[PDB]
Symmetry: C2
Subunit: 221 residues, 2 copies
């Protein structure tokens, strides 16, 4: 079985809409509901735990809450929100951590991440070739190097894990700042396997990204 | 003089339109015309050299040829196209190499690149922190490491250079694979300075990208 943990507790500062980003609409439906729909449509998710902004917990339990759909208060940062949500994950052998902000993630991608876990990988992350050339820079913006593009991946969510591995990794988390779950698992020396991602699993962060997402939804309508 | 070189001689295989990408329309206008419009709006570009597929050289001179724009036949790959365009740049102080596919590149971004060159940087590239976490992977796609995202930039165009530095680099360029001009200059350890890019300067590559570009254009047109 697979449980999805959905961090949806951020304030959406960069989205500029005056409300937490999970509750901004896309085609008239909140981003959170899009993310939940993708998870349910994949057919491979047995349980969902959603971390929401703390003040909205009670209202969220009423709107989004249900038997296989558990609301928890989120934390100060994404790492804390995921840690809190893991307390409610239950006994599923696999955990997928999926940003509510990646609202148009295709159910296909979710299914592929679970399939790779079931195959035997302990940690599975979707990734794509970076669209732009990546350069390493120093603190003043001077280029230090241009890593080989073929060996880089821009990663997305859901990031999938054997549950025991993810719990171990989060039990070692310190201070936060990290918003990539795989990084915590890498610190245990657990192998992390990249699988093909999907350009539609982009993270909605700014008003431009929402314009883009509206365009995608309208084009696939 | 600041000269922009625009390689536009590619076939656009990944756009899957069956015709060269720079001539595919966006909002009723070829990507190339959008890119030229941005360069002109910046008010910092003196002239432009455009490399186009040899077949379309004559037509292109009629459509895009101008008092400030010269059309030349491009090459089999981007590197050759840039080299051929450099032949026609004249006595430039600065050369900016700009991908026509980044059709919605803001003029302020173009001006930032030129401004930094005038400050005395030999090589200047626009960039932003990557929107996604970047991982290094081995041949099987297993993670080798996660570089500090804050120390990475996803770079864009125009890439700006002191003309002599770029010309010396292009003299020893290898044909094929090389589509980041700064990388060529980096081979010698020439310093390259990042200036702020802009999410609008995305490279139109796929059918999806073009759908997105149409939507951006519509959004900003009131
Ligand atoms: N304290 C937090 C911060 C973030 N998130 C979640 O982590 C995902 C990725 O975060 P991000 O895209 O940064 O969203 P926000 O933090 O809401 O946006 P911003 O950083 O612009 O304020 C989002 O689904 C967000 O709701 C969370 O659950 N708890
Ligand atoms: N032989 C070539 C190949 C590419 N370019 C130019 O370089 C820019 C970036 O290249 P890319 O986005 O890869 O465009 P294409 O090569 O046309 O697309 P594809 O690789 O999908 O065929 C484009 O403006 C393109 O016209 C060029 O001048 N000469
Ligand atoms: Mg955030
Ligand atoms: Mg190409």
């Amino acid at each position: 079985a697979t449980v999805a943990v959905v961090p949806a507790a951020g304030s959406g500062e960069r989205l500029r809409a005056g409300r937490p980003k999970a509750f901004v609409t896309l085609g008239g439906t909140p981003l959170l509901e899009h993310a939940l729909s993708g998870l349910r449509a994949s057919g491979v998710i047995d349980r969902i735990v959603i971390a929401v902004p703390p003040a909205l917990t009670d209202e969220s339990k009423l709107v989004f809450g249900g038997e296989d759909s558990v609301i928890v208060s989120g934390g100060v940062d994404r790492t804390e929100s995921v840690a809190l949500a893991l307390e409610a994950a239950g006994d599923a052998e696999f955990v997928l951590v999926h940003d509510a902000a990646r609202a148009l993630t295709p159910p296909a991608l979710i299914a592929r991440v679970v399939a790779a876990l079931k195959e035997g990988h302990s940690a599975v992350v979707p990734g794509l070739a970076p669209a732009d050339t990546i350069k390493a820079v120093d603190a003043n913006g001077a280029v230090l190097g241009t890593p080989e593009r073929a060996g880089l991946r821009a990663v997305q969510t859901p990031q999938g894990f054997h549950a025991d591995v993810l719990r171990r990794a989060y039990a070692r988390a310190t201070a936060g700042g990290v918003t990539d779950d795989a990084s915590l698992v890498e610190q245990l020396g657990t192998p992390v396997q990249i699988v093909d991602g999907d350009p539609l699993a982009f993270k909605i962060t700014t008003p431009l990204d929402l314009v883009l997402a509206e365009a995608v939804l309208a084009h696939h309508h």
